[PDB]
Amino acid sequence: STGSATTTPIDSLDDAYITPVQIGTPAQTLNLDFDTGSSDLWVFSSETTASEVDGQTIYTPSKSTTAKLLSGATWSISYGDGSSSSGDVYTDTVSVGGLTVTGQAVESAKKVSSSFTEDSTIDGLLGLAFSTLNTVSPTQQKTFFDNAKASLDSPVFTADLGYHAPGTYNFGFIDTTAYTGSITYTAVSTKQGFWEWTSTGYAVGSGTFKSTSIDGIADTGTTLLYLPATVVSAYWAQVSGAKSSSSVGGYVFPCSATLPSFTFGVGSARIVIPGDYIDFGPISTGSSSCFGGIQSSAGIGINIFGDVALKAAFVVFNGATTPTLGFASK
């Protein structure tokens, strides 16, 4: 089997991407944030505290003939940006882009933090990291990909995120029309439950490539690119007037600037992030100070190849017995 679904930015900054997912019988379609940095599929639901729902589409298990309470199971998750959610669990039929999993754990939110409430366009998350990170207790549950894997034509999914435009998540096949050149594959460590790999270095603009190992995760659920302070300082030093602002919470730059590209290494290959991808616009409405898309990972504890980086590539998440990651230009 295979599946193919379009993913769409939630706003004009590409702060996140939503992909329609069919849950239950008859289908209830919710728009979920596919997150390769977590491993819970959770949704706004009929159980969610009413004051914490503001515009989201909810899953109502009582209207699904295939929904079953997973008795005794609870879940609770906290994300890197400080947001969180928690609730109980149903199993139900879940389909993405024509690919169907029966018995998928669908985590029903009883509580969500303010950032989720305030984002009316995100109806929940679908985690695509390794199932060892799944938070369901006392019986840990598998991700949608893990459940689908054996039925897939090939044990892979791909992320093809757009810059200010729709893109695609495919399951079970590599669309050879979706990228240019060849795909370069690189080793993954699953030790922390992430799609963790090591980039071979970077360049700023038309500058020379610096060979240096940068360990980090491929995380579709993180907006920006978080890298070591040394790397990030070297980037922003090439933008007149750029500075790290404690009050704003990262590097800012004059909105009048033309940003340089940023290149990262994948083995001997190179992925180029155009400067425009690094512009996250005014820090507040009408400001002439703009927020940078490359930020320091210092104090996160891990480097994160978020959407800023991933949207510059066609990315293969290879879930074969020895997982790997592939990157191609597009």
Find, among 27, 10, 17, 171, the residue nearest to 97 by Cα.
Answer: 171
The rounded distance, in Å, linking the Cα atoms of 131 and 306 is 20
Amino acid letter at 77?
A: I
Stretch (H or E) spanning 75: strand 68-78
Query: Looking at the structure, do residues 195 and 127 belong to the same domain, yes or no?
Result: no
Query: Looking at the structure, do residues 136 and 226 belong to the same domain, yes or no?
Result: no
The rounded distance, in Å, linking the Cα atoms of 248 and 293 is 13
DSSP-H helix ranges across 140-299: 144-148, 229-236
Tell me the resolution in Å.
1.4
Contact 193, 146 (CB under 8 A): no
The rounded distance, in Å, linking the Cα atoms of 271 and 251 is 22
199 in catalytic set: yes
Helix (H, G, I), strand (E, B) or coil at 281: strand
Query: Looking at the structure, do residues 201 and 329 belong to the same domain, yes or no?
Result: yes
**Count of CA atoms in the C-beta half-sphere (13 A) of 209:** 16
Helix (H, G, I), strand (E, B) or coil at 245: strand
The rounded distance, in Å, linking the Cα atoms of 317 and 129 is 10
Helix (H, G, I), strand (E, B) or coil at 151: helix
The rounded distance, in Å, linking the Cα atoms of 119 and 31 is 12
Tell me which residue range forms the domain holding 308: 175-330
Contacts of 53 (CB under 8 A, 6+ apart): 44, 117
Helix (H, G, I), strand (E, B) or coil at 84: strand
Strand pairing report for 210-218 and 303-305: parallel
Distance from chain centroid for Cα 243 = 27
Q: By CB neighbour count within 10 A (0-12 exposed, 13-18 middle, 19+ buried), where does 154 fall?
A: middle
Query: Looking at the structure, do residues 49 and 71 belong to the same domain, yes or no?
Result: yes
- Active-site hit among 14, 33, 35, 279: 35
Find, among 131, 96, 107, the residue nearest to 2 by Cα.
Answer: 96
Amino acid letter at 44?
A: F
The rounded distance, in Å, linking the Cα atoms of 189 and 194 is 7
Question: Which residues share a beta bridge with 208?
Answer: none
Structure determination technique employed: X-ray
Which token pair is 175?
């669309």
Query: Looking at the structure, do residues 194 and 125 belong to the same domain, yes or no?
Result: no
Query: Looking at the structure, do residues 149 and 185 belong to the same domain, yes or no?
Result: no
Find, among 118, 107, 32, 33, the residue nearest to 77 by Cα.
Answer: 107
Query: Looking at the structure, do residues 164 and 233 belong to the same domain, yes or no?
Result: no
Which CATH number fits the domain that encloses residue 112?
A: 2.40.70.10
Query: Looking at the structure, do residues 203 and 135 belong to the same domain, yes or no?
Result: no
For 87-90, the CB contacts below 8 A with 24+ separation are 87/42, 87/45, 87/47, 87/48, 87/111, 88/47, 89/136, 89/141, 90/61
Number of folded domains in the chain? 2
Helix (H, G, I), strand (E, B) or coil at 224: coil
Q: Which of 157, 174, 191 is a domain's end point?
A: 174
The rounded distance, in Å, linking the Cα atoms of 22 and 18 is 13
Query: Looking at the structure, do residues 63 and 142 belong to the same domain, yes or no?
Result: yes
Q: Which of 148, 174, 200 is a domain's end point?
A: 174
Query: Looking at the structure, do residues 220 and 204 belong to the same domain, yes or no?
Result: yes
Which token pair is 81?
């940006």
- Active-site hit among 38, 64, 131, 199: 199
Query: Looking at the structure, do residues 167 and 108 belong to the same domain, yes or no?
Result: yes
Q: Which of 125, 153, 174 is a domain's end point?
A: 174
Q: Which residues of 220-243 are buried (b: 16+ CB within 10 A; e: fewer)?
A: bbbbbbbbbeebbebbbebbeebe
CA 260 vs CA 214, 276, 292: distances in Å:
20, 8, 12
Query: Looking at the structure, do residues 65 and 162 belong to the same domain, yes or no?
Result: yes
Q: What is the maximum alpha-carbon separation in the chain? A: 60
Contact 56, 123 (CB under 8 A): yes
Q: Which residues of 49-69 are buried (b: 16+ CB within 10 A; e: fewer)?
A: eeebbeebbbbebeebebbee
Which token pair is 138?
């006392």
DSSP-H helix ranges across the chain: 114-118, 144-148, 229-236, 307-310
276 in catalytic set: no
